[PDB]
Design a protein around this ligand. Structure first.
Ligand SMILES: Cc1cc2nc3c(=O)[nH]c(=O)nc-3n(C[C@H](O)[C@H](O)[C@H](O)COP(=O)(O)OP(=O)(O)OC[C@H]3O[C@@H](n4cnc5c(N)ncnc54)[C@H](O)[C@@H]3O)c2cc1C
Ligand SMILES: Cc1cc2nc3c(=O)[nH]c(=O)nc-3n(C[C@H](O)[C@H](O)[C@H](O)COP(=O)(O)OP(=O)(O)OC[C@H]3O[C@@H](n4cnc5c(N)ncnc54)[C@H](O)[C@@H]3O)c2cc1C
Ligand SMILES: [Mg+2]
Ligand SMILES: [Mg+2]
Ligand SMILES: [Mg+2]
Lengths: 662, 662, 55, 55
């Protein structure tokens, strides 16, 4: 039922690869497009389409992730950060936290490609999603794309508090932070959730599984890891593959698919440089170490790796407030209701991503003056020039994203912060011919001195905005930076009466404190009389820092940052000779053709020369449709019907038609 | 994403303000209307759209209300009644009990405005709601308005009993009491519940959130309390605002929005006079006390405050009968079924407002003769002249609207009575420049002697109609007037065997009575034999009163009346020079323009010169569409398309189309 | 305390309409500088007149 | 349970701050019930060295 020779191969099941695959199959119908993926098929998989069970996908024993491990680095205090990668069809779209956001207009301009300008990509960004939200800026958001975006069907009350708290810190509340022209802001964060159904909006169901029902000319080859891309006579005409799991040691197996006219790498920013390097694309010197024969000289493959630096800081919440923390804990009685409401209706806690509100930031020069002089020096060259770019982002999660086995029982609200444009640059490289062998690579977290100041400053900022929220009960001190014990900057725990409130009536140890493990939090200043009851506020004292209280936050960040999976770079656009933005030299042409070979293209999110200050999923879709359009013109097909609409039953706004709301 | 200069500002998120905002945005599309609100956004908030959890909104610690407190008064026996106000977008429409009713035709005639006559407002009242009920008078009720009205999806069996009981007291049963031409009557009371969905029908979802999805030209600025309305060169061109909650004491913040052509105050009858007074609209003498400079001389601002005087009198119900009392109690097992039925189906106890039936009243002269001579004197001038006007109203609630922590366990049916046109007149005034400072004000409850007689008389009436109901088990004596202990008029408790019926099999104290805290109720007279089994009745003896039993009811009413939130007046229509209906002088023109300034209008329910004998929500919608139409003509826009339909997917009657019933 | 008796799920705890009952004021704060076992927080003494005696 | 801060049966004296404890202010609880700490103790049994009483 599967033929050996596809017309257009599309390696990878990544969200970008599903874009290229779905769009490409659609343009001709007659054309035969075969997609190859190293992972399980995900059609109608309950653990994928329903949004609220996202954290499970990240477990270490979890099937759907690869968990690459980095070489140890001094900068992380000897820490060896894991760098997880998606391993299911649809890529990370089947796994992601479903945060929605969009990068600055300056970002796409920074690629400085012959194309790829924001002015050109705006319509293409507009073509790939419908916008369930009550849009005000309708000249930018699409309104009838395959992928749906909304606020979900449930809303934790945390968001209003986070907004009233952020607004008091001099951070403006902007209705749309995805406008592409903003630094400071706050918003009720959008999610990749189909509001009309409550399902996750991954690219696979929207592009691949929606096309296959409708059209015969698409082949899905799940569970076949790519080994190598055979190339001869200057054309990339084949791709030998191996099974994803080597279950038959005595007789290893492989298969060689053929592509008549085009080939495409959408394997993600980690796997892809490896696949090029196994084919011999790289430095001959670096490649002889693995014994692979160097076919083409591309030093830039594997270089210029880039991430974001998230780190979580939980704060305990009052007992009376709602959280998803007890669902993922997870109780057998709460969880039953949480599912039962979703099947019965479609609107429940399960039908929402955890994160509820968030704040992009660009520091005031007055507060910028106290940052380390190195970062000031970086700010002048990098951000001084451009107004559009945020330096750092943080949001708020209505629960604890982490291991609940290792934290005290209760309900928490956890702040999430990720640096927007880390200066640091990593690398990656294969060590062995074997597909299965783990690459050695240096993500290079905190490799550059300049990356620390914004991190510390955002912890100092987010703590203050979590201290002004109505929900706040006290920091969880075990998961906060290790301040000296007598410091006034210290992370205080929950009150005694709240300790009784969580402990239950029958506890024999609530306020009992021996060993001084934690310090009780002081009562809030009394509400003013003579104010309107709705305007009264009771508030904790502001905290202040010294050098010894800064070193602690610094060590905290060094010892607890990790990849945010916004990884990109490696194979990237630029001159073959080299450029300032890509010191080792680029490998792609502006038309996404790999240098030195004919017929090979990259659809990965790796393509980007430099960071996009937004969650990476949107650029995945966008780059996937760029490479799709490029393949389209490369085939010589007319600009008429060059647009490649997927089948879908469009639902209107509920007031336009009666069949579309929750 | 938010601009500084809106085309038409609409301060307030009140139901009337949501009317003006939605209707106004619709007429031009091109016109830029920005709405500013001091409270949280309420889109898709479970605690708002589903009807059956209305009582919670009234808790003292509740977020969604302001709870203003009055100066002490002798007339209330030193009592300091709180006067709660809505604090959420959509105003009180997101909070209300969802009672539906409509005022007398004489009422709108009493405004004696150049417009505002009932003959003119009838089509406009007709344009603002669809009428899910099986209407008989279709020449008055609208049938395709944005806001939906019905009997809800559940019906407690209390209503039939209340009707059979009321019918025996000489009170006629009228199919439609909203006809606008009636005094005596009884009806199965309507509710502001969308029968087709079971959701609450607040103005916000119907006008604001339905417009924003569809149209870009509307801005919602939630969480920004208004401070002042800047005015210069005779035009009201700005409105500086402050955050609703002062979370940053060291650096207070504010922002100044600009309105190009129009401004509108829809802040409610309490907040609005305050906002005018902070701007300097009032007596210079009264205003110098707060230090505000008097810009315009408007003595009538803040004066002529008016309410209704509700007071609740619970009666215990038999154990075998249904009540919502155990849901709001609230049990963890009953409440689970009550939700589960609503998600599963949409038709449950949760999908209904508590109140089930009610009776407008205008006393017979024979029974009027025993009322205090002062009220007779008021009746001759005020009601003798007009036949249309009821003197007082009461309904019945299928549960106990109050604090269940403070009442004995059981199931209750509680009578609810509110005076239709209280004679008394209050006032309100700012004490400080600060927005947050609580105003000093005198609601003036029972300020006039004449307001007592109808109250006492309605207690005497409602008790007798609660004594003829089949459900009746006995008064709860702690919440009834403190009659002398030996009196035959006394409030008797439940029978002994019913005491065992509530106490359970295992109780060790059911009929045990020590201290004579309560008197057991006597058994009903035996059912007549020889009557048809369906016509047999067993009935308690009629009670009779003397002066000492009247003084008790009088003190009860003095010590337990409160605002019914039908507050109105303050800023109100009339000549600037003064009028008999508004002794201090009006402030609005008949075209709702505030006196002495250009470009400022009031959309509040405060506009009314005198009481409307109906629940105030309908007049809110009506006045909002009046001011909307006035803004429309004020902009010079044509009478063609001057009507401003909101988007909506109209559902027909189920026999006209198959997609609309519960 | 009304919330403490009403349970987590109550829809009517501090809700007060009709002024059926008056909430009690908070006790005077415990003195610091006393031994923790000797600290006391106490309600104000009440006083009577003829009309409060007839009752 | 006897050791809880809100517990009735203990006095919880608080020490002056000291640098040696890194600014920490250790509480020094004392029994407050008849029978003293015998009504509160962990009930560990042990006996001292013979040299001790000689000391
Ligand atoms: C846990 C998690 C949470 C995240 N949350 C968010 C979020 O909330 N919002 C957001 O914007 N971004 C988020 N992302 C990041 C975002 O999903 C990724 O940037 C995006 O999916 C990148 O897509 P891609 O096409 O580049 O790579 P991928 O989606 O990883 O596509 C790569 C695919 O190729 C396959 N593959 C790899 N090697 C081979 C090989 N040798 N042969 C065959 N197949 C191979 C992989 O199995 C995978 O299916 C998250 C990511 C993680 C993983
Ligand atoms: C608990 C409750 C139950 C009720 N039940 C019923 C019922 O069953 N049926 C019925 O007919 N009526 C009922 N009502 C009354 C009815 O809802 C009100 O008459 C009606 O909503 C009045 O609307 P409004 O537009 O005049 O004021 P509102 O609805 O209060 O509009 C005022 C808005 O402006 C905002 N605001 C106030 N000050 C400022 C400021 N400085 N800056 C910015 N914003 C400000 C407020 O937050 C509010 O959103 C009830 C009311 C209460 C509150
Ligand atoms: Mg990834
Ligand atoms: Mg009100
Ligand atoms: Mg001792």
């Amino acid at each position: 039922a599967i033929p050996e020779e596809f017309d257009i191969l599309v390696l990878g099941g990544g969200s970008s690869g599903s874009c290229i695959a779905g769009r490409l199959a659609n343009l001709d119908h007659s054309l035969k497009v075969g997609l190859i993926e190293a992972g399980e098929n995900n059609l109608n998989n309950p653990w994928v389409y329903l949004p609220g069970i996202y954290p499970r996908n990240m477990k270490l024993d979890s099937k759907t992730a690869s968990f690459y491990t980095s070489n140890p680095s001094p900068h992380l205090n000897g820490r060896r950060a894991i760098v997880p990668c998606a391993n299911v069809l649809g890529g990370g779209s089947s796994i992601n936290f479903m945060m929605y956001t969009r990068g600055s207009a300056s970002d796409y301009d920074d690629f400085q490609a012959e194309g790829w300008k924001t002015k050109d990509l705006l319509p293409l960004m507009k073509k790939t999603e419908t916008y369930q939200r009550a849009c005000n800026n309708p000249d930018i958001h699409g309104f009838e794309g395959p992928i749906k975006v909304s606020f979900g069907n449930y809303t934790y009350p945390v968001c209003q508090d986070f907004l009233r708290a952020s607004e008091s810190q001099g951070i403006p509340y902007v209705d749309d932070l995805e406008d592409l022209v903003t630094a400071h802001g706050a918003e009720h964060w959008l999610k990749w959730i189909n509001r009309d159904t409550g399902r996750r909006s991954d690219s696979a169901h929207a592009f691949v599984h929606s096309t296959m029902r409708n059209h015969d000319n698409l082949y899905l080859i799940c569970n076949t890891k790519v080994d190598k891309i055979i190339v001869e006579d200057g054309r990339a005409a084949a791709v030998r593959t191996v099974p994803s799991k080597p279950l038959n040691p005595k007789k290893p197996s492989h298969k060689i698919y053929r592509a008549r006219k085009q080939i495409v790498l959408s394997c993600g920013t980690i796997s892809s440089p490896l696949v090029l390097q196994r084919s011999g694309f790289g430095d001959p010197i670096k490649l002889r170490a693995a014994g692979v024969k160097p076919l083409v000289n591309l030093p830039g493959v594997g270089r210029n790796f880039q991430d974001h630096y998230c780190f979580f800081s939980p704060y305990r919440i009052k007992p009376q407030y709602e959280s998803f923390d007890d669902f993922v804990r997870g109780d057998a009685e709460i969880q039953k209701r949480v599912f039962d409401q979703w099947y019965a209706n479609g609107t429940g806690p399960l039908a929402t991503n955890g994160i509820e509100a968030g704040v992009k930031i660009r520091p005031t020069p007055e507060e910028l003056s106290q940052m380390d002089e190195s970062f000031q020096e970086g700010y002048r060259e990098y951000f001084e020039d451009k107004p559009d770019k945020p330096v750092m982002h943080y949001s708020i999660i209505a629960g604890f994203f982490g291991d609940h086995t290792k934290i005290p029982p209760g309900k928490y609200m956890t702040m999430f912060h990720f640096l927007e444009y880390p200066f640091s640059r990593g690398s990656i490289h294969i060590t062995s011919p074997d597909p299965y062998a783990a690459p050695d690579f240096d993500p290079g977290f905190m490799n550059d001195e300049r990356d620390m100041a914004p991190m510390v400053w955002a912890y100092k900022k987010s703590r203050e905005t979590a201290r002004r929220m109505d929900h706040f009960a006290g920091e969880v001190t075990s998961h906060h930076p290790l301040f000296p014990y007598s410091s006034e900057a210290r992370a205080l725990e929950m009150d005694l009466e709240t300790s009784n409130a969580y402990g239950g009536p029958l506890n024999l140890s609530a306020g009992l404190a021996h060993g001084s493990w934690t310090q009780p939090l002081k009562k809030p200043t009394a509400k003013n009389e003579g104010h309107v009851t709705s305007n009264q506020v009771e508030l904790h004292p502001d905290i202040e820092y010294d050098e010894e209280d800064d070193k602690a936050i610094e060590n905290y960040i060094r010892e607890h940052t990790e990849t945010t999976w916004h990884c990109l770079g490696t194979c990237s656009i630029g001159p073959r000779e080299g450029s300032k933005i890509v010191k080792w030299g680029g490998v792609l042409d502006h038309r996404s053709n790999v240098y030195g070979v004919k017929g090979l293209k990259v659809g990965d999110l790796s393509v980007c020369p430099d960071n996009v200050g937004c969650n990476t999923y949107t650029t995945a879709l966008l780059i996937g449709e760029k490479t799709a359009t490029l393949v389209g013109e490369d085939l010589g097909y007319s600009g008429e019907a060059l647009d490649m609409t997927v089948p879908q039953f469009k639902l209107g706004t509920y007031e336009k038609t009666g069949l579309a709301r929750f």
